[PDB]
Design an enzyme around this catalytic site. Structure first.
Site, PDB file in Angstrom:
ATOM      1  N   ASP A  28       0.829  -1.207   0.000  1.00  0.00           N
ATOM      2  CA  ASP A  28       0.000   0.000   0.000  1.00  0.00           C
ATOM      3  C   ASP A  28       0.866   1.262   0.000  1.00  0.00           C
ATOM      4  OD1 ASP A  28      -2.370   1.703   0.285  1.00  0.00           O
ATOM      5  OD2 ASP A  28      -1.808   1.864   2.406  1.00  0.00           O
ATOM      6  N   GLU A  54       0.777  -3.120  -5.073  1.00  0.00           N
ATOM      7  CA  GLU A  54       0.438  -1.731  -4.779  1.00  0.00           C
ATOM      8  C   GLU A  54       1.664  -0.947  -4.309  1.00  0.00           C
ATOM      9  OE1 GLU A  54      -3.757  -1.812  -3.016  1.00  0.00           O
ATOM     10  OE2 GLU A  54      -3.099   0.231  -2.537  1.00  0.00           O
ATOM     11  N   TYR A 128      -1.548  -8.389  -8.834  1.00  0.00           N
ATOM     12  CA  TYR A 128      -2.358  -7.405  -8.124  1.00  0.00           C
ATOM     13  C   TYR A 128      -3.612  -7.234  -8.973  1.00  0.00           C
ATOM     14  CZ  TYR A 128      -3.966  -2.973  -6.175  1.00  0.00           C
ATOM     15  OH  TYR A 128      -4.721  -1.968  -5.615  1.00  0.00           O
ATOM     16  N   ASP A 167      -2.258 -10.261  -4.272  1.00  0.00           N
ATOM     17  CA  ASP A 167      -3.561  -9.713  -3.917  1.00  0.00           C
ATOM     18  C   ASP A 167      -4.541 -10.052  -5.034  1.00  0.00           C
ATOM     19  OD1 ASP A 167      -5.769  -8.278  -3.078  1.00  0.00           O
ATOM     20  OD2 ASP A 167      -4.728  -6.355  -2.924  1.00  0.00           O
ATOM     21  N   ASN A 169      -7.833  -9.846  -4.633  1.00  0.00           N
ATOM     22  CA  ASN A 169      -8.966  -8.924  -4.493  1.00  0.00           C
ATOM     23  C   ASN A 169     -10.305  -9.656  -4.500  1.00  0.00           C
ATOM     24  OD1 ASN A 169      -8.810  -6.080  -3.958  1.00  0.00           O
ATOM     25  ND2 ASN A 169      -7.567  -5.868  -5.820  1.00  0.00           N
ATOM     26  N   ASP A 240      -5.330 -12.118   0.030  1.00  0.00           N
ATOM     27  CA  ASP A 240      -4.019 -12.489  -0.478  1.00  0.00           C
ATOM     28  C   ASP A 240      -3.802 -13.986  -0.305  1.00  0.00           C
ATOM     29  OD1 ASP A 240      -2.745  -9.546  -0.805  1.00  0.00           O
ATOM     30  OD2 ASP A 240      -3.832  -9.658   1.100  1.00  0.00           O
ATOM     31  N   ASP A 265      -2.253  -1.708   4.997  1.00  0.00           N
ATOM     32  CA  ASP A 265      -3.520  -2.294   5.417  1.00  0.00           C
ATOM     33  C   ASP A 265      -3.628  -3.762   5.029  1.00  0.00           C
ATOM     34  OD1 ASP A 265      -3.610  -1.436   2.787  1.00  0.00           O
ATOM     35  OD2 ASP A 265      -5.425  -0.223   3.028  1.00  0.00           O
ATOM     36  N   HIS A 266      -2.624  -4.300   4.343  1.00  0.00           N
ATOM     37  CA  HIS A 266      -2.455  -5.732   4.177  1.00  0.00           C
ATOM     38  C   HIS A 266      -1.297  -6.212   5.045  1.00  0.00           C
ATOM     39  CE1 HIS A 266      -5.016  -6.259   0.429  1.00  0.00           C
ATOM     40  NE2 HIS A 266      -4.966  -4.949   0.592  1.00  0.00           N
TER      41      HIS A 266
END
EC number: 3.1.11.2
Length: 275
Positions: A28, A54, A128, A167, A169, A240, A265-266
DNA sequence: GCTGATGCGCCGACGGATCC
DNA sequence: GGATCCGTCGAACGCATCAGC
């Protein structure tokens, strides 16, 4: 309820010792993440391969700390050409045999979401995956992207087994997030993204490493919104993954969620393979 | 050069209704 | 009438651009 990852299982079910440690982390914002001591945690994790998503950082802007990594000296980076968003990187102790970018046409569609690296015994893909966006305004794109990605991964011209990490998502099942019912029209838990994850497992084919080892373990998440102190309450999603070819399953020693490593935040995830 | 405002991408708390 | 369902709404982060000095 809080969650405590079980101890690292570094021996395969049949007793072979792990020889490959892979870590994956949506940071992030890579420059932010480094300032919050994310590299400090990577040094302690000491993976053979590090996959980041990210990064939000073109390769000219990469902090010099990333060059003080002698155990991760082969570094490959990807950013989209248009937009401070996306970005992905792959760092490896050993030099891979081949490296590629995108899922088919990156040279014209420079998206900076996927890196492919071929090693001696396997092919690694770090991804991602495009977010369906707030109000689902990009869900149809994600559905179309999912289909191009399935075919691309299926279409690998290698007989080598595949490791897909990063990730993705999507929280596959209700167990994979804290509020499944209030979130079924939210990005990451729509029927459409979930079905696409299901079809990824089936079409390629691939297995969900963590879920294969811990098929009934709830409350295990890899993302928590910065908001509303969700992390402290462990209101999170499992976004993830490490996805393995079926042949690699006997080699699987463990799939970890590093819940306590901050900086994004991951949180990091880590794969132990006996190759 | 530097700061901070705005723009943009990335859901859990809340209030109110329905169910037996 | 507690539990559950549903829809609305505000806002932590990081980064780019921009205005001002």
């Amino acid at each position: 309820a809080l969650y405590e990852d079980p101890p690292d299982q570094k021996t395969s079910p049949s007793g072979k010792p792990a020889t490959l440690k892979i870590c994956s982390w949506n940071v992030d914002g890579l420059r932010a993440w480094i300032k919050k001591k994310g590299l400090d945690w990577v040094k302690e994790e000491a993976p053979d391969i590090l996959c980041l998503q990210e990064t939000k950082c073109s390769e000219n802007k990469l902090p010099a700390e990333l060059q003080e990594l002698p155990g991760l000296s082969h570094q490959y980076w990807s950013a989209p050409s248009d937009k401070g968003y996306s970005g992905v990187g792959l760092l490896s102790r050993q030099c891979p045999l081949k490296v590629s970018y995108g899922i088919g046409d990156e040279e014209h569609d420079q998206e900076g979401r996927v890196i492919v690296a071929e090693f001696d015994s396997f092919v690694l893909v770090t991804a991602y995956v495009p977010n369906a966006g707030r109000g689902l305004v990009r869900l149809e794109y994600r559905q179309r992207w999912d289909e191009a990605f399935r075919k691309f991964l299926k279409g690998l011209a290698s007989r080598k087994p595949l490791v897909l990490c990063g990730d993705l998502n999507v929280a596959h099942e209700e167990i994979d997030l804290r509020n499944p019912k209030g979130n079924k029209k939210n990005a990451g838990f729509t029927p459409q993204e979930r079905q696409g994850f299901g079809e990824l497992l089936q079409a390629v084919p691939l297995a969900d490493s963590f879920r294969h080892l811990y098929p009934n373990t709830p409350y295990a998440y890899t993302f928590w919104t910065y908001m509303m102190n969700a992390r402290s309450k462990n209101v999170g999603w499992r976004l993830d993954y490490f996805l393995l070819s079926h042949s690699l399953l006997p080699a699987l020693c463990d799939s970890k969620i590093r819940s306590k490593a901050l900086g994004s935040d991951h949180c990091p995830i880590t794969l132990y393979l006996a190759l």
